[PDB]
Inverse folding.
């Protein structure tokens, strides 16, 4: 497993891989890798000849410099994990290598609408940071395929739109949330549930799946759908916290034009705030 | 010569050229081609196996609908010219092919600083329109080389900065403006030159060349270089010179960090007002 830190050396490896006709997959990350990321790598290994993982804590997508400074860095552990997964190349550049003149005067890429809704409304500049570094990485790595998790549904929608709009010939693979055999989304948060709570916890996915079924069956009274969903969660032992249904492609309210919906649920159980999402074809 | 109008069909051709192992030069244009565009094509042909010319009147870089609608569209005559030049492929998409959902919500690319200075300052959104469509063309065509005319020095700097920042593996070639064998910059305004004035007119490029030579030799007293150039022009019969010297990469004053300069000059020959330009490596 090669670990590459500079642009010239990356371009050399990438040119040579492609010269040899290898199909390349890219998994962009900011390090601090966990099982979620290992599934992205496994999907990339099955779909391509060569897998490239980028590890870069990107200053452009942080709200303030103190947050950037506190972000966890675990490069050695990250590299041990990817080496065990047989990754071919890790690109781990410094901030000066990527942003030699800083970020403020660097060219950027902005996806209208998606970047300034939901999470992006409370984090100005964040998604601009995401679309800029992912575009740069696509040009540097020239992948055939790139893998992103469905848990971060907003980033996935953002990148899908960026790719379509900017003409990149890259397949974007959205990797579904990993689940236990009973349907519960795997998460560190499950660690805070008592055993009796752990037995109740699969109810969240059941309710989420119920919502999807209704939507798939033409129900469009979202307010009622959501009211019943909360009641059901609460009668199960949860404390419903937030339930939202949106257009999956544009992240706007579902309308007569929506073709896919994304459902987001959060509900407290004990000291855990469990979270899940699902996309449904319309 | 192939004429391609849709993205899927262009992509097919780009895949074919990759399989054939051909190096590709791209010449982006907004059509309504003339001899100076033919000079771009000839430079592309000399540097690559295959030449792709794009013809697309990009709404995103137009101030008002009026100006867009009124822009001359002459595809057939453009295509007859490129065929005589032995161009391999012409990409001429429709607006809906490029901007199926309009330009306002389309992903965009912005280059700080360069986009808002000089001509950029009075034309909000204009250079964002350019960086956007050129990035898209680069992603669609994936050329090895792209050719741009030196006369639009602001665009050239804009695209060189975009390429460096966004990580495109593409050589950007600036093509010096077209010129008579005696050195006179070609121009529709030349027609107003009488026989005698046409005889004096090559002196302008001689003075420009002298400025260029001085900057090459290390000279950095711009005011003095420019005052002397004005005196030389006066002596040859020109009047009311307007001469500017800029860093060609940042478009600001020449500095200790400057690596390239653009010299711009305008001078009157009787009632005719001649302009010319020259770029120089420092």
């Amino acid at each position: 497993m090669l670990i590459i830190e500079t642009l010239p050396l990356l371009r050399q490896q990438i040119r040579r891989l492609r010269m040899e006709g290898k199909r390349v997959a890219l998994v962009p990350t900011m390090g601090n890798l966990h099982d979620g990321h290992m599934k992205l790598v496994d999907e990339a290994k099955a779909r391509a000849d060569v897998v490239v993982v980028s590890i870069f804590v990107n200053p452009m997508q942080f709200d303030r410099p103190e947050d950037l400074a506190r972000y966890p860095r675990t490069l050695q552990e990250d590299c041990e994990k990817l080496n065990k997964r047989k990754v071919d190349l890790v690109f781990a550049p410094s901030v000066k290598e990527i942003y030699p003149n800083g970020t403020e005067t660097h060219t950027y890429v902005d996806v209208p609408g998606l970047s300034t809704m939901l999470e992006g409304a409370s984090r100005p500049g964040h998604f601009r940071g995401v679309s800029t570094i992912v575009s740069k990485l696509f040009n540097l790595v020239q992948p055939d395929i790139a893998c992103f998790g469905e848990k971060d549904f907003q980033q996935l929608a953002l990148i899908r739109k960026m790719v379509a709009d900017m003409g990149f010939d890259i397949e974007i693979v959205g990797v579904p949330i990993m689940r236990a055999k009973d349907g519960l989304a795997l998460s560190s948060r499950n660690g805070y549930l008592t055993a009796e709570q752990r037995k109740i916890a699969p109810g969240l996915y059941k309710v989420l799946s119920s919502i999807a079924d209704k939507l798939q069956a033409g129900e469009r009274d979202l307010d009622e759908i959501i009211t019943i969903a909360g009641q059901e969660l609460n009668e199960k032992g949860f404390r419903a916290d937030d339930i939202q249904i949106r257009d999956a492609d544009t992240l706007l309210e579902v309308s007569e034009t929506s073709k896919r919906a994304v459902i987001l649920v959060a509900a407290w159980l004990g000291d855990a705030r469990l979270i899940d999402n699902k996309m449904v074809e319309l």
In short: Chain B has two domains: 1-179, 180-282. The interface with chain A takes residues 7, 11, 104-113, 131, 135-137, 139-140, 142, 161-162, 165-169 of chain B (CB under 8 Å). Strands of chain B lie at 2-4, 24-29, 50-55, 89-91, 108-110, 145-149, 171-175, 239-247, 260-269, 272-281. The longest helix of chain B spans residues 126-141.
